[PDB]
């Protein structure tokens, strides 16, 4: 399985 | 662009142990992590236009670390990090490091700042440093292993300014680190 997590500011 | 980023977690790490790195200023910022597991990510703002970033892989395998300035990747981003499975016998959390050369500052013009590293309660692993100043100039730190699992190491600032030292045992950033001076 491929997963994509991410955060921004 | 205004954004620099380096450190252990863009190369390597271990499962269920935070892959860490630094991001510096020089708009608003962002990161994302394609990988074999749901990674969890956080940028802890240090205050100083730099922030400790750590993500948490739960799978051995390779993860792609995109740092993103605006609308688009950082210079070398994505970075590509191979995460190793946690050896049964490696305890980075249990490494300690310390001494004059890891403070606030006091670290003067051209002059050596000492510091040691006690890896003895820390199991088996490769030691690796990552040091750049406040301009992404690399910092040379001769590290002399004493034998017993401790390490004499020092460097020479030139500045009434800040130098950043990241410390990795078995490719995993160490407690109290990255040290800022």
Curated annotation (Swiss-Prot), chain A:
PTM description: Glycocalicin is the product of a proteolytic cleavage/shedding, catalyzed by ADAM17, which releases most of the extracellular domain. Binding sites for vWF and thrombin are in this part of the protein.
Cellular localization per UniProt: Membrane
Superkingdom classification of source: Eukaryota
Function: GP-Ib, a surface membrane protein of platelets, participates in the formation of platelet plugs by binding to the A1 domain of vWF, which is already bound to the subendothelium.
Other observations noted: Platelet activation apparently involves disruption of the macromolecular complex of GP-Ib with the platelet glycoprotein IX (GP-IX) and dissociation of GP-Ib from the actin-binding protein.
Subunit structure: Two GP-Ib beta are disulfide-linked to one GP-Ib alpha. GP-IX is complexed with the GP-Ib heterodimer via a non covalent linkage. Interacts with FLNB. Interacts with FLNA (via filamin repeats 4, 9, 12, 17, 19, 21, and 23).
UniProt disease link: Non-arteritic anterior ischemic optic neuropathy: An autosomal recessive ocular disease due to ischemic injury to the optic nerve. It usually affects the optic disk and leads to visual loss and optic disk swelling of a pallid nature. Visual loss is usually sudden, or over a few days at most and is usually permanent, with some recovery possibly occurring within the first weeks or months. Patients with small disks having smaller or non-existent cups have an anatomical predisposition for non-arteritic anterior ischemic optic neuropathy.
Record-given protein name: Platelet glycoprotein Ib alpha chain
Protein's organism: Homo sapiens (Human)
Residues of the full protein shown: 603 to 611 of 652
Swiss-Prot record, chain B:
Modified how: Ubiquitinated by FBXL22, leading to proteasomal degradation.
Location(s), subcellular: Cytoplasm; Membrane; Cytoplasm, Cytoskeleton; Cytoplasm, Myofibril, Sarcomere, Z line
Reported tissue expression: Highly expressed in striated muscles. Weakly expressed in thyroid, fetal brain, fetal lung, retina, spinal cord and bone marrow. Not expressed in testis, pancreas, adrenal gland, placenta, liver and kidney.
Filamin repeat intervals: 1-83, 87-181
Subunit structure: Homodimer; the filamin repeat 24 and the second hinge domain are important for dimer formation. Interacts with FLNB, INPPL1, ITGB1A, KCND2, MYOT, MYOZ1 and MYOZ3. Interacts with sarcoglycans SGCD and SGCG. Interacts (via filament repeats 17-18, 20-21 and 24) with USP25 (isoform USP25m only). Interacts with FBLIM1. Interacts with XIRP1; this interaction is mediated by filamin 20 repeat. Interacts with KY. Interacts with IGFN1. Interacts with MICALL2. Interacts with ANK3. Interacts with SYNPO2.
Similarity annotation: Belongs to the filamin family.
Pathological association: Myopathy, myofibrillar, 5: A form of myofibrillar myopathy, a group of chronic neuromuscular disorders characterized at ultrastructural level by disintegration of the sarcomeric Z disk and myofibrils, and replacement of the normal myofibrillar markings by small dense granules, or larger hyaline masses, or amorphous material. MFM5 is characterized by onset in adulthood, clinical features of a limb-girdle myopathy, and focal myofibrillar destruction.
Misc. remarks from the entry: Silenced in MKN28 and MKN74 gastric cancer cell lines due to aberrant methylation of the gene.
Function (record text): Muscle-specific filamin, which plays a central role in sarcomere assembly and organization. Critical for normal myogenesis, it probably functions as a large actin-cross-linking protein with structural functions at the Z lines in muscle cells. May be involved in reorganizing the actin cytoskeleton in response to signaling events.
Name of the featured protein: Filamin-C
Species of origin: Homo sapiens
Encoding gene, per UniProt annotation: FLNC
């Amino acid at each position: 399985p491929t997963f994509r997590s991410s955060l921004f500011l | 662009q205004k954004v620099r980023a380096w450190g252990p977690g863009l190369e390597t790490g271990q499962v269920g142990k935070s892959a860490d790195f630094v991001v510096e200023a020089i708009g608003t910022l962002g990161f994302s992590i394609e990988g074999p597991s749901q990674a969890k990510i956080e940028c802890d703002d240090k205050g100083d236009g730099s922030c400790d970033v750590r993500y948490w892989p739960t799978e051995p395998g390779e993860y792609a670390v995109h740092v993103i300035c605006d609308d688009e990747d950082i210079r070398d981003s994505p970075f590509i990090a191979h995460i190793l499975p946690a050896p049964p016998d490696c305890f980075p959390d249990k490494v300690k490091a310390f001494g004059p050369g890891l403070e606030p500052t006091g670290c003067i013009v051209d002059k050596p700042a000492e510091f040691t590293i006690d890896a003895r309660a820390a199991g088996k692993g490769d030691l690796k440093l990552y040091a750049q100043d406040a301009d992404g100039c690399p910092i040379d730190i001769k590290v002399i292993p004493n034998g017993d699992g401790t390490f004499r190491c020092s460097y020479v600032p030139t500045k009434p300014i800040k130098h950043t030292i990241i410390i990795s045992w078995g490719g995993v950033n160490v407690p109290k680190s990255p040290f800022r001076v």
